[PDB]
Structure formats: structure tokens, C-alpha cells
Amino acid sequence: KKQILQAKRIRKNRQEYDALAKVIQHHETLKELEALGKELEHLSHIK
Amino acid sequence: KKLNRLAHIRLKKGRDQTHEAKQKVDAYHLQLQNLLYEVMHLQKEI
Numbered sequence: 001k002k003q004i005l006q007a008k009r010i011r012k013n014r015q016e017y018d019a020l021a022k023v024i025q026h027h028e029t030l031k032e033l034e035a036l037g038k039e040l041e042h043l044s045h046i047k
Numbered sequence: 048k049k050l051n052r053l054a055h056i057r058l059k060k061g062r063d064q065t066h067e068a069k070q071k072v073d074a075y076h077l078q079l080q081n082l083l084y085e086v087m088h089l090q091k092e093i
Contacts, residue, residue: 007093 003090003093
């Protein structure tokens with residue numbers, strides 16, 4: 001019974017974590033911005 | 048001969064009573080094993 005209470009607590013924590021993961025899903029970005037800046041510099045040199 | 052027959056009959060009765068007690072203990076142990084399996088599975092799920 002104590003373990004069932006603990007499992008209810010763990011299920012609430014897992015639901016909160018799943019809500020957080022779905023909210024986040026709803027380093028690479030900086031590299032993409034750097035590549036876009038290099039492409040903009042190349043386009044400025046071409047212009 | 049009469050003493051041997053009496054002793055053999057007493058040994059048979061004693062072995063039968065022991066077998067009955069063994070069956071009772073085995074039933075109690077199976078109930079306890081079911082309880083322990085339930086507890087273990089409940090701890091595994093929780």
C-alpha cells in the first residue's frame with residue numbers, strides 16, 4: 001500500500017515530465033545561425 | 048507374528064498421518080507462496 005502511494009507519486013512526476021517533454025517538443029541552432037551568417041557574408045561578397 | 052503384524056500396521060498408520068500433515072503443510076506453503084508472489088509483483092509494478 002505504501003508502494004502504491006509511492007507509485008502514484010511517481011506517476012504524477014512522470015506525467016509532469018511528459019508534459020514538460022511535450023511542451024519542449026511543441027547547440028545546433030547556433031551552428032545553423034553561424035552557417036546562415038557565413039552564407040550571408042558570401043552573398044554580400046557576391047553582391 | 049502378531050507383534051510383527053501390529054508393528055507393520057502401526058507404521059502404515061504413522062506414515063499415512065505424516066503424509067496428511069505433509070499435504071496440509073504443502074497447502075499452507077502454496078498459500079504463502081501465492082501471497083509472496085503477489086507482494087513481489089506489487090513491488091515490481093510499484
